[PDB]
Design a protein around this ligand. Structure first.
Ligand SMILES: Nc1ncnc2c1ncn2[C@@H]1O[C@H](COP(=O)(O)OP(=O)(O)OP(=O)(O)O)[C@@H](O)[C@H]1O
Ligand SMILES: [Mg+2]
Lengths: 50, 121, 42, 57, 119, 50, 221, 240, 100, 121
């Protein structure tokens, strides 16, 4: 996810269902948008397994 | 738009510090109510004084409230607000009483009401 | 203002340790600080 | 007069000895902290005018 | 031979050991104790100093405040409000303390001077 | 005394030229940073171009 | 409605090798009301998923951003979803923060605490300042490994807590410019072998003697 | 509606519980330290008592601090209480003991004059319109010998004189780590207690300049040592 | 507007039991004669702030001189606003008493 | 069914003693964790060491760990368990090092471990 808290404390695998749950204006959309943006370098690699 | 890229980094930093101080004050309020303010740290007593002055300085005399108070309203530019609350969070007004922060405009009205209560700034 | 000021001088506002009814301490519970002298001299 | 002056200066130059010893660390730390605030004053100006050109570009 | 020396402050044991000789100054006059000596009770002068002399070491000088002194069959005991060894004293602080107008701190400073070998 | 004074100025110039070392490393890193970030700048400029 | 959500979220799978080996990772978002995770739909989706990230407004206001409550957050997959380097440098992190959270009541009485207790207090403050992160600035896994190495190896005990973030930032900057080999072999081998740790420690010490705190003081041990 | 209020009250009680547990552990540590201080101050007291007894066995026992003045009119009561307030019945027990002492004094015709050490005693007696002669605050947590010296000096100078005829002290004796007893001691005038003979072929002491000068310059120091021990014991008791 | 009455304030002796922190009038000074509008200008905000201060300072040992002055003034105002049942006052006497 | 009418009186006594010791250790654990270990008494330490031994002896070489370690699991009869924990609470093993109690079966395995770690009695 590119987020130290998640990637270190609550790691996410490939094939896993990770719930992002919060009150409101807590930063859930930001967490998911950063998880999306972090795959930019994996996309640049051109490797279909990455 | 409370974002470092939209409102600038000074605006954002001052807003975040105000919010942090007020959240810590809200966390302490129940301990203060039960055990008294003297059971806190000196760190926390300082923070509580600053937070009460900040909570009072956020209030303002509005133009549409002259019917409920009889006192005309005031306008505060955004740069004056940022500078004022920066000074508040740094601690430059820890000597002025809790009042004189209550229902006023910018910094000059703060000075006027502080001298009306016997204090500098 | 002046009517209030001339009235307050003649106003009679209605503003000594209590008893507490506590019994006397036993005279032997009160400890005595003594010089423990070593010469027997009644 | 020369003997008392002699051991007087002796304790006086022990005084001066460890005072110079302390001055060593004194302006060593002075120089290197100057160097620190220099090395960070530089490379922060660089980042700043970096953002200068990021935004005007 | 040697005599047991014990210097106790009001809230701490200042020193305790054995000695060859012990010089100090009673309100009545200076005095030197040696391993055997008459039982004695005395009051040190207000700015007293206590020089302990040991066989294999250098003599240990101590400044004492409001001291009392007693020599018995077991050894010497010195009672102090406060005590300060020689290798703990600022001679300049003690010097400016000596010139005070308050007699108590003046005596404190004079004792701190006597310990360092001045005055 | 001779010992202490010679040690004094020895440490003095040690400090001085090692400070030159650290600050010249700093200025090389400064030019490096300016390089990389301005590269980023106009490679983002062309991003908005397309 | 439980079926409505579980039928959707069970299509996120990791296929076997005879089906291609593809995968679909799910990140369902749930908005609670007044932190009531005991509501109906929150309960359903907490029951369904493989782990939860609880974001809170009180942590968000205190400056902890992302406001992830690491005490109640969980991942039932765990270390199987990590590389070796991150599994090593961050296996120390959970109970560090547990100790810090159960010690922070004594923040005003660190003089009365044991040696190890004050050590845990300072380390926990540093680690909490470490997990903070700006918005839209994700870091690759090698930089996260290096940052959590800073945290758990003890190389932050010399830096003021109000200087950790910047410190870490600048250090990574330095490492991206000067010593790219450490990050490169972390990325390629997925493990931080002891020699890379040696070179990293020396890099940290040099950067420390180059780094200047905000109070003017030093950061050198 | 009251669900919000109930959850808020649960959070409030949790905060209070955290703070009180922290304070309990802190008090455990601090009473360890206070017991250490008391035990290390004990030896000087023992040895000054011995020196005083061996001085009094061969002196003139007519010091002002040793004779019970005929027709005592007033007694000085020093009440040793705390500044911080999270103690239990500590100040309460102190005040009930001092009230028993006041009734004892008034059943013998002595109007008590009141000196206090701490803030809680000043609250208790300023609420009841008492006239406290002199107060002392801010050192009930870690009392030092200079505070005891000041207190004892003012006390003995009010005794030797607007002037009192005996000095009492009400403090909490510390014992057992579970015993904290508010006790009233009479520190002046001292009663003299011929103990024993314990003098056979024993060698007589030598006094410089004489016996009575040392006795009369050592007695106020003894009273000050006793006041210091009282302050230390009351501090350890407050922490318990 | 609303005049919120409470049973706690009633038992404490505050009668009428109006809770000034939540009570309000949305007409304001237009519903008052000019004398009372100038005299009782910021009375409700002053009393709300006083109740807040007295709830905050409930256990505090020592406070500012201004906080003490505010506590005394707010108290005196509270005892001024109490009034028996079946006992009205003309608007001039109310003006005079709030002036006091 | 931890009731004397089902398991027996001795089983109940031993279980209640173990639970009392572990609960007292749980009471002392926070003062240990904040102030340090010999801030405590020496009675408290005796209890803490006994409790560490008891808390570690409740572990076992489970049959599920044989696939990872090769050594077969244990099956301790309830009588031997009662005897072992009775002796542990009496203090018959307060000298054996703590690591001798991790993942073992009955009393004989504990003895063999103690011997391969240089202690007995
Ligand atoms: N890591 C972060 N650091 C600083 N600010 C952040 C961070 N994450 C989010 N924010 C700020 O918090 C605000 C709310 O973020 P976001 O919109 O992601 O929350 P949300 O869960 O989508 O809330 P909602 O869905 O109710 O709008 C945003 O304005 C964003 O600027
Ligand atoms: Mg959103």
């Amino acid at each position: 996810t590119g987020i130290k808290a998640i990637d270190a404390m609550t790691p996410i695998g490939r094939g896993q269902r990770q719930l992002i749950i919060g009150d409101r204006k807590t930063g859930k959309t930001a967490v998911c948008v950063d998880t999306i943006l972090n795959q930019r370098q994996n996309w640049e690699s051109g490797d279909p397994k990455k | 738009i409370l974002d470092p890229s939209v409102v600038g980094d000074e605006h954002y930093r001052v807003a975040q510090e105000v919010i942090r101080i007020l959240q810590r004050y809200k966390d302490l309020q129940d301990i203060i109510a039960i055990l008294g303010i003297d059971e806190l740290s000196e760190e926390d007593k300082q923070l509580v004084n600053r937070a009460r002055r900040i909570e009072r300085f956020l209030s303002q005399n509005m133009m549409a409230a002259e019917q409920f108070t009889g006192q005309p309203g005031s306008t505060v530019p955004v740069k004056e607000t940022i500078e004022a609350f920066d000074r508040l969070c740094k601690g430059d007004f820890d000597h002025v009483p809790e009042q004189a922060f209550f229902l006023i405009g910018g910094l000059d009205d703060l000075a006027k009401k502080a001298e009306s209560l016997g204090a500098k700034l | 203002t002046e009517v209030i000021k001339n009235f307050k001088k003649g106003f009679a506002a209605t503003g000594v340790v209590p008893d507490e009814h506590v019994e006397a301490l036993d005279e032997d519970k009160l400890a005595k600080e003594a010089v423990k002298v070593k010469k027997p001299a009644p | 007069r020369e003997r008392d002056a002699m051991v007087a200066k002796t304790l006086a130059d022990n005084k001066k000895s460890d005072e110079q010893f302390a001055a060593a660390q004194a302006d060593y730390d002075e120089a290197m902290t100057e160097a620190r605030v220099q090395a960070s004053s530089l490379r922060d100006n660089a980042r700043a005018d970096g953002r200068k050109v990021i935004e005007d570009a | 031979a040697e005599l047991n020396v014990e210097i106790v402050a009001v809230d701490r044991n200042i020193w305790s050991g054995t000695a060859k000789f012990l010089f100090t100054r009673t309100t009545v006059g200076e005095i030197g104790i040696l391993p055997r000596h008459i039982p004695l009770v005395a009051q040190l002068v207000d700015d007293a100093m206590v020089r302990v002399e040991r066989e294999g070491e250098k003599d240990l000088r101590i400044a004492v405040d409001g001291g009392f002194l007693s020599v018995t069959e077991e050894g010497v005991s010195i009672l102090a409000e406060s005590a300060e060894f020689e290798s703990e004293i600022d001679e300049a602080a003690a010097k400016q303390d000596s010139e005070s107008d308050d007699p108590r701190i003046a005596a404190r400073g004079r004792a701190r001077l006597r310990a360092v070998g001045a005055i | 005394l001779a010992e202490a004074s010679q040690a004094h100025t020895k440490a003095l110039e040690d400090a001085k030229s090692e400070a030159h070392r650290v600050v010249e490393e700093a200025r090389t890193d400064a030019e490096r940073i300016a390089e990389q970030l301005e590269a980023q700048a106009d490679v983002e400029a062309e991003r908005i171009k397309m | 409605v439980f079926y409505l959500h579980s039928r959707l979220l069970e299509r996120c799978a990791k296929l076997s090798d005879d089906l291609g080996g593809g995968s679909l990772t799910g990140l369902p978002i749930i908005e609670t009301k007044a932190n009531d995770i005991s509501a109906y739909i929150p309960t359903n989706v907490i029951s369904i998923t493989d782990g939860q990230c609880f974001l809170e407004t009180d942590l968000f206001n205190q400056g902890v951003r992302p406001a992830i409550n690491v005490g109640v957050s969980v991942s039932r997959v765990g270390g199987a979803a990590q590389i070796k380097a991150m599994k090593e440098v961050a296996g120390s992190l959970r109970l560090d923060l547990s100790q810090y959270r159960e010690l922070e009541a004594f923040a005003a009485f660190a003089s009365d605490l044991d040696a190890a207790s004050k050590a845990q207090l300072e380390r926990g403050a540093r680690l909490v300042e470490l997990l903070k992160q700006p918005q839209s600035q994700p870091m690759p896994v090698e930089e996260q490994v290096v940052s959590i190495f800073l945290g758990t190896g003890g190389h932050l005990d010399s830096v003021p807590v109000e200087d950790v973030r910047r410190f870490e930032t600048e250090l990574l900057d330095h490492m991206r410019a000067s010593e790219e080999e450490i990050l490169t072999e972390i990325r390629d081998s997925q493990k931080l072998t002891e020699e890379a740790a040696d070179k990293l420690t020396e890099v940290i010490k040099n950067f420390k003697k180059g780094f200047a705190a905000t109070g003017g003081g030093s950061v050198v041990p | 509606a009251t669900l919000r209020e109930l959850r808020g009250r649960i959070r409030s009680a949790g905060s209070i519980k955290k703070i009180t547990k922290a304070q309990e552990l802190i008090a455990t540590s601090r009473i360890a330290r206070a017991q250490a201080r008391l035990e290390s101050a004990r030896p000087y007291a023992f040895e000054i008592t011995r020196m005083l007894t061996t001085l009094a066995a061969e002196a003139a026992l007519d010091h002002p601090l040793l004779v019970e003045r005929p027709e005592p009119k007033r007694a000085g009561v020093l009440v040793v209480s705390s500044d911080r307030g999270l103690c239990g019945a500590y100040n309460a027990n102190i005040f009930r003991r001092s009230e028993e002492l006041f009734s004892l004094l008034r059943e013998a015709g002595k109007q008590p004059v009141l000196y206090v050490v701490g803030r809680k005693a000043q609250n208790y007696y300023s609420f009841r319109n008492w006239n406290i002669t002199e107060s002392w605050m801010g050192f009930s947590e870690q009392p030092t010998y200079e505070n005891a010296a000041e207190i004892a000096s003012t006390l003995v100078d009010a005794f030797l004189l607007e002037g009192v005829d005996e000095l009492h002290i009400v403090y909490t004796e510390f014992k057992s780590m579970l015993s904290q007893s508010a006790e009233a001691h009479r520190i002046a005038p001292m009663v003299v207690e011929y103990v024993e003979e314990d003098i056979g072929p024993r060698t007589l002491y030598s006094f410089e300049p004489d016996a009575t000068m040392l006795f009369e310059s050592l007695l106020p120091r003894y009273l000050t040592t006793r006041v210091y021990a009282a302050l230390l014991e009351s501090a350890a008791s407050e922490l318990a």
